[PDB]
């Protein structure tokens, strides 16, 4: 009757709403040729498209929050769920809780313990008198010197398979049909607020799931100025994530050339014991070049003054205290798990623009039996590695905390953070968020129908 237009259905209109879905992984279809019996994640893991597509959306402004990002939570539970699936088929070490008779190794206060103990053979009749070599961190005495496994009173224990490797490989997160992933292309982005230039991708960039504390290793570099990120900045309870401009060369080696016993606890099962150490008598150490660490510090200390004020004193110091995972730099190199003393790097005091040799070193401790992510009921034994392990990684960022003692208007001190591994994933995921596409739409037009 009254004119004019009529409703009309449009399919595929550009309308999306912020939402959450279940994301899968992608390995680049080369990681599969890397083989070594299912390295890390990739087994049936989806091959990445040789030509990923990134579409820049013009005349668009979208508001991002990285701390509210849901992609982080899936990845955190993924690595955890990934971890258990790796330890299920492997050999369980349950009857290793046998009494340990230990003694001091032939310098640096006997960090290594030579332990003799009784063990079950293939046959169920006669036991086996054999010795092994454990770090001081893996054992605890109970009251010659008698020791025991450190994890036995807390939980059970299982050995990781020598076939698989913990080597981080690039993993692309993609979204299923009907969804989309937004990417923030600005050079300077702190993870909160509106984003001027936004592009969309089916898959996120190459992300190496490197689990580390107090140091972001093998991560993505920032653009131009170094970045400063915090959930709540003025709040001293929230950690402060830092993104580096130039990568920092770091060396961590295992200056112990070792051998594998490969003792037989059959039928069919074989445990890899740590034999005698042939080589340098040394404790594990981590190298950082004095010139390269300082330059970054000088550029970073200036960025904190875009918040804490033009002029103020910023002092750095080592970890306050807590669990070993919190107080030291924890990571994996060559299959072994290093815990490094970062106290030497964080000893400095800075002026407004400045601070008042050719190398630096960091003492590292080795622990084979670990419970990360506060896991109880499952302890993983890192198998020994033949020969000396040497590794070189990039230091791409930090986890930092601010002191609560204030004296807020006087000076501020920062210390290396730890704990939550989500922050590590938030470091790479800050520029991405998940939305679902709503294709269906209605618009008024004259066509009507016959």
């Amino acid at each position: 009757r009254a004119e004019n237009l009529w409703v009309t259905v449009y399919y595929g209109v550009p309308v999306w709403k912020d939402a959450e879905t279940t994301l899968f992984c992608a390995s680049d279809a080369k990681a599969y040729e890397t083989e070594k019996h299912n390295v890390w994640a990739t087994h049936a893991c989806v091959p990445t498209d040789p030509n990923p597509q990134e579409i820049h959306l013009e005349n668009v402004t979208e508001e991002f929050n990285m701390w509210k990002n849901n992609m982080v939570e899936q990845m955190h539970t993924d690595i955890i769920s990934l971890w258990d699936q790796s330890l299920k088929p492997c050999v369980k070490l349950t009857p290793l809780c046998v009494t340990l008779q230990c003694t001091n190794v032939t310098d640096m206060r006997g960090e290594l313990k030579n332990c003799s103990f009784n063990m079950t053979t293939e046959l169920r009749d006669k036991k086996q008198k054999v010795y092994s070599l454990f770090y001081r961190l893996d054992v605890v005495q109970i009251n010659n010197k008698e020791y025991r496994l450190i994890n036995c009173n807390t939980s059970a224990i299982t050995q990781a398979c020598p076939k698989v490797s913990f080597e981080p490989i690039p993993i692309h997160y993609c979204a299923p049909a009907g969804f989309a992933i937004l990417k923030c292309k600005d050079k300077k982005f702190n993870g909160t607020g509106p984003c001027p230039s936004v592009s969309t991708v089916q898959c996120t960039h190459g992300i190496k799931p490197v689990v580390s504390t107090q140091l972001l290793l093998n991560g993505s570099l920032a653009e131009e100025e170094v970045m400063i990120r915090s959930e709540n900045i003025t709040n001293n309870a929230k950690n402060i994530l830092v993104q580096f401009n130039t990568p920092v060369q770091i060396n961590c080696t295992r200056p112990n050339n070792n051998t594998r016993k490969s003792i037989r606890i059959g039928p069919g099962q074989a445990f890899y014991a740590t034999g005698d150490i042939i080589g340098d008598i040394r404790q594990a150490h981590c190298n950082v070049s004095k010139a390269t660490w300082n330059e970054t510090l000088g550029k970073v200390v200036k960025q904190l003054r875009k918040h804490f004020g033009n002029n103020t004193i910023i002092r750095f110091a080592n970890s306050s205290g807590g669990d070993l995972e919190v107080t030291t730099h924890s990571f994996n190199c060559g299959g072994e798990f290093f815990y490094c003393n970062t106290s030497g790097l964080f000893n400095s005091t800075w002026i407004s623009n400045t601070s008042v040799n050719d190398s630096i070193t960091l003492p590292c401790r080795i622990k084979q039996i670990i419970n990360m992510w506060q896991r109880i009921g499952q302890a993983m034994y890192a198998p020994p590695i033949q020969g000396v392990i040497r590794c070189v990684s990039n230091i791409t960022g930090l986890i930092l905390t601010r002191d609560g003692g204030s004296t807020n208007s006087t000076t501020e001190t920062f210390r290396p953070g730890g704990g939550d591994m989500r922050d590590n994933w938030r470091s790479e995921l800050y520029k991405y968020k998940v939305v679902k596409i709503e294709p269906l739409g209605v618009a008024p037009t004259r066509c009507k129908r016959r």
């Binding site: 009529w6 409703v7 259905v9 399919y11 959306l57 269906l440």
Partner: protein
């Protein structure tokens, strides 16, 4: 692919077609690469069933006999296609969206096909 999302609705009608489309024996992660694509085909058919039961029965664009109510975004035609964008458009209709949906399935394909059956007898 979404390129006109920032552009006006009038320009957004040209690229409409691109938006339509972009061992397996594992015990675990097999459910992770499955559960995602299964709800995808469930979400896919969810939209398509609506397209059939309405006056469309076909994809892309299709029209209907439902008259546009003035009370629903009273506007200028050039104020819609030429001056306005889809994200900005779906924002206002958000209240009347469920109302419009009813007019397509009820007022049309329920009352139209029956109307058609009566017009097909003679």
């Amino acid at each position: 692919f979404l390129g006109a999302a920032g552009s006006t609705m009038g320009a957004a009608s040209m690229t409409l077609t691109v938006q339509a489309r972009n061992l397996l024996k594992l015990t675990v992660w097999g459910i992770k690469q499955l559960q995602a694509r299964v709800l995808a085909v469930e979400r896919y058919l969810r939209d398509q069933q609506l397209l059939g039961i309405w006056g469309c029965s076909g994809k892309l664009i299709c029209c209907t006999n439902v008259p546009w109510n003035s009370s629903w975004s009273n506007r200028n035609l050039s104020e819609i296609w030429d001056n306005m964008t889809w994200l900005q458009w779906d924002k206002e209709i958000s209240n009347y969206t469920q109302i419009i949906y009813g007019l397509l399935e009820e007022s049309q394909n329920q009352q139209e096909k029956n109307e058609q059956d009566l017009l097909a007898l003679d």
